[PDB]
Design a protein around this ligand. Structure first.
Ligand SMILES: *[C@@H]1O[C@H](CO)[C@@H](O[C@@H]2O[C@H](CO)[C@@H](O)[C@H](O)[C@H]2NC(C)=O)[C@H](O)[C@H]1NC(C)=O
Ligand SMILES: *[C@@H]1O[C@H](CO)[C@@H](O[C@@H]2O[C@H](CO)[C@@H](O)[C@H](O)[C@H]2NC(C)=O)[C@H](O)[C@H]1NC(C)=O
Length: 240
């Protein structure tokens, strides 16, 4: 019978958080339950973790310890606003609900009807983005670009990109193709960040061919009845 050390089980504890946040698809949790009984006197089950996540991001209000509890190895707690949720295999710098001005998550359990599709150019220039769901800022003196995503419920897919996601929920690196993963928090429904920032460094020649695929959302007023309308088309935005 092999038991985890304090730091070993903590990484797996964070590994479980990352998996539940949906920032990772893999975990190592062999030995985590015994490590919670011994070091926390608790059952480390899925219910426990979703409330740790719920409290840390939305609901908790005092100071928190490294294991995301609010007011033995972890009876000490932090005044600063973040924990480094670091499993060893992956890490994310996550800010507590306490540290922000209000709530910077949005509820995506809500129904909204599908933004109707309407034709548009397959390739969109980075410097003339007409979609409302993201906004680009270019820093030629640092040869960096930042893409602000204003509608995170609308997918942004990365291809051959190597970026840093910045947001008021968590900050983390992404290194693989596909839809940008975001922290998912359950609180009478599923919440994701209300806005996030994709930071792309051109000094790193490894994203020489970084390109973004997204649903370009167009906001309009239909002239006949005077009401606001939303439409979308698939488009690619090339960087570098
Ligand atoms: C997140 O959105 C969901 C879905 O809109 C909310 O869940 C519903 O909440 C209402 C009350 O506001 C209940 O009457 C419904 O039964 C719930 N479920 C469904 C399927 O509609 C949820 O309350 C929202 N969460 C927050 C924190 O506002
Ligand atoms: C970004 O990637 C996601 C999947 O990672 C794409 O969503 C798929 O869209 C097709 C057609 O709409 C569906 O048949 C699949 O079931 C979807 N997959 C998932 C997991 O939802 C999305 O279309 C991609 N975006 C762009 C602009 O290409």
């Amino acid at each position: 019978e092999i038991i985890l050390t304090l730091s070993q089980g903590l990484k797996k504890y964070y590994g479980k958080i990352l998996r539940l946040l949906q920032l990772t698809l893999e975990e190592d949790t062999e030995g985590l339950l015994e490590w919670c009984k011994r070091n926390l006197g608790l059952d480390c089950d899925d219910t426990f973790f979703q409330k740790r996540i719920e409290e840390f991001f939305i609901t908790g209000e005092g100071h928190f310890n490294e294991v995301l509890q609010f007011r033995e190895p972890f009876k000490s707690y932090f005044a600063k606003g973040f924990l480094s949720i670091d499993s060893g295999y992956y890490s994310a710098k996550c800010y507590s609900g306490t540290s922000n001005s209000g709530l910077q998550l949005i509820n995506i359990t809500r129904h909204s009807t599908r933004i109707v599709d309407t034709p548009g150019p397959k390739i969109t220039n980075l410097k003339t983005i007409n979609c409302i769901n993201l906004k680009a800022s270019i820093f030629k003196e640092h040869r960096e670009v930042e893409i602000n995503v204003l509608l995170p419920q609308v997918a942004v897919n990365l291809s051959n990109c190597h970026v840093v996601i910045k947001s008021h929920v968590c900050d983390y690196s992404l290194d693989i193709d596909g839809a940008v993963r975001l922290p998912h928090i359950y609180h009478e429904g599923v919440f994701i960040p209300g806005t996030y920032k994709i930071v792309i460094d051109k000094k790193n020649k490894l994203n020489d061919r970084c390109t973004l695929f997204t649903d370009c959302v167009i906001k309009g007023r239909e002239v006949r009845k005077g009401q606001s309308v939303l439409r979308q088309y698939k488009t690619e935005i090339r960087i570098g």
